[PDB]
Design an enzyme around this catalytic site. Sequence first.
Site, PDB file in Angstrom:
ATOM      1  N   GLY A  16      11.886   1.261 -13.490  1.00  0.00           N
ATOM      2  CA  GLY A  16      10.821   0.271 -13.492  1.00  0.00           C
ATOM      3  C   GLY A  16       9.786   0.452 -12.402  1.00  0.00           C
ATOM      4  O   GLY A  16       9.735   1.497 -11.748  1.00  0.00           O
ATOM      5  N   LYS A  33      12.255  -3.259  -6.432  1.00  0.00           N
ATOM      6  CA  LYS A  33      12.288  -2.554  -7.706  1.00  0.00           C
ATOM      7  C   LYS A  33      12.717  -3.493  -8.835  1.00  0.00           C
ATOM      8  O   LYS A  33      13.763  -4.138  -8.752  1.00  0.00           O
ATOM      9  CB  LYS A  33      13.208  -1.324  -7.636  1.00  0.00           C
ATOM     10  N   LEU A  72      10.340   2.418   3.495  1.00  0.00           N
ATOM     11  CA  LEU A  72       9.971   3.613   4.252  1.00  0.00           C
ATOM     12  C   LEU A  72       8.520   3.914   3.864  1.00  0.00           C
ATOM     13  O   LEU A  72       8.118   3.711   2.713  1.00  0.00           O
ATOM     14  CB  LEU A  72      10.914   4.794   4.000  1.00  0.00           C
ATOM     15  N   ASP A 116      19.783  12.368 -10.286  1.00  0.00           N
ATOM     16  CA  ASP A 116      18.332  12.537 -10.461  1.00  0.00           C
ATOM     17  C   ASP A 116      17.559  12.737  -9.138  1.00  0.00           C
ATOM     18  O   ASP A 116      16.559  12.067  -8.860  1.00  0.00           O
ATOM     19  CB  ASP A 116      17.771  11.351 -11.269  1.00  0.00           C
ATOM     20  N   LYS A 118      14.999  14.187  -6.638  1.00  0.00           N
ATOM     21  CA  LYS A 118      13.647  14.749  -6.719  1.00  0.00           C
ATOM     22  C   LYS A 118      12.881  14.373  -5.442  1.00  0.00           C
ATOM     23  O   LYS A 118      13.300  13.449  -4.739  1.00  0.00           O
ATOM     24  CB  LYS A 118      12.930  14.266  -8.007  1.00  0.00           C
TER      25      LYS A 118
HETATM   26  O1  LIG Z   1       8.164   4.831  -2.016  1.00  0.00           O
HETATM   27  C1  LIG Z   1       7.708   4.359  -0.961  1.00  0.00           C
HETATM   28  N1  LIG Z   1       8.437   3.469  -0.236  1.00  0.00           N
HETATM   29  C2  LIG Z   1       9.812   2.995  -0.376  1.00  0.00           C
HETATM   30  C3  LIG Z   1      10.542   2.999  -1.566  1.00  0.00           C
HETATM   31  C4  LIG Z   1      11.794   2.476  -1.265  1.00  0.00           C
HETATM   32  C5  LIG Z   1      12.990   2.265  -2.214  1.00  0.00           C
HETATM   33  C6  LIG Z   1      12.634   1.638  -3.575  1.00  0.00           C
HETATM   34  C7  LIG Z   1      13.406   2.973  -3.468  1.00  0.00           C
HETATM   35  N2  LIG Z   1      11.796   2.166   0.083  1.00  0.00           N
HETATM   36  N3  LIG Z   1      10.598   2.478   0.628  1.00  0.00           N
HETATM   37  C8  LIG Z   1       6.309   4.746  -0.464  1.00  0.00           C
HETATM   38  C9  LIG Z   1       5.777   6.022  -0.860  1.00  0.00           C
HETATM   39  C10 LIG Z   1       4.472   6.430  -0.472  1.00  0.00           C
HETATM   40  C11 LIG Z   1       3.675   5.574   0.320  1.00  0.00           C
HETATM   41  C12 LIG Z   1       4.169   4.310   0.730  1.00  0.00           C
HETATM   42  C13 LIG Z   1       5.470   3.899   0.345  1.00  0.00           C
END
Ligand SMILES: O=C(Nc1cc(C2CC2)n[nH]1)c1ccccc1
Length: 279
Positions: A16, A33, A72, A116, A118
């Site tokens: 999603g 998510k 992150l 998965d 990647k």
């Molecule tokens: O995916 C990002 N952040 C993130 C995703 C996640 C969890 C949901 C799997 N934690 N932190 C992201 C990528 C590029 C720029 C800013 C944030």
Amino acid sequence: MENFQKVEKIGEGTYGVVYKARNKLTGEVVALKKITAIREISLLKELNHPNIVKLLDVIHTENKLYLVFEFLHQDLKKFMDASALTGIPLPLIKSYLFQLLQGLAFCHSHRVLHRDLKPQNLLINTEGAIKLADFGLARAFGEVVTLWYRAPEILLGCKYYSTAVDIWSLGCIFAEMVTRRALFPGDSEIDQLFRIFRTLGTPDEVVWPGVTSMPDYKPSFPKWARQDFSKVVPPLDEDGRSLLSQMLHYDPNKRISAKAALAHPFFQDVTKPVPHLRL
Ligand SMILES: O=C(Nc1cc(C2CC2)n[nH]1)c1ccccc1
């Protein structure tokens, strides 16, 4: 969700949409998510490691499932694209690979597979840390999804794959960080399988016992010879090429485990550099 204040949309995943959110009560910035599954996801809330993105909470409301994760600031895919001209320096590639293998070793010891892996689900921070996101979500549930990092046993129809699938995926990512190009960029299942065969040689009963009896194996598969690793991943040193070859072994049983990979000579001079991140 009602308790969360959506900041922006990060992207679209396999299950999603992923959002950046802020808790109205605690003030914590999280990644939200929106997706037997309830029990399997609840087991992953206890699967904590500094190289695994923390599953903060599992919210089940109005037949919809919301997964709250640690936030992150950047994924490895975007970081690779941003470092495509100069290249990610080798000490940082080594640090990233070492940390990811530690996260894999942990999950694999608890019998949890990713399936998965990647660059998109590998998250990085300013501190030099790299973390695995969406771990165990494939066992719980089940845009074009990438086949680039998919192990040959999965492509050949094996229903009961092992932890070795994650090692293959990470080996493809390792090769990609070094070369700045995808190792096996397949656009169909057969193109994926044939790109693997063209580089590593069409497997036979010698290198992989039981390959000819696999569900989707066809005796009509063209027979290509193996290319040397020096041609596949230059200018990676002998230690790295040796580790890569063990991570890319056809037979899942011959393929190096995450624990054994951590002991490989390539990690003798491993350090933890700080990356150049412009957020
Ligand atoms: O995916 C990002 N952040 C993130 C995703 C996640 C969890 C949901 C799997 N934690 N932190 C992201 C990528 C590029 C720029 C800013 C944030």
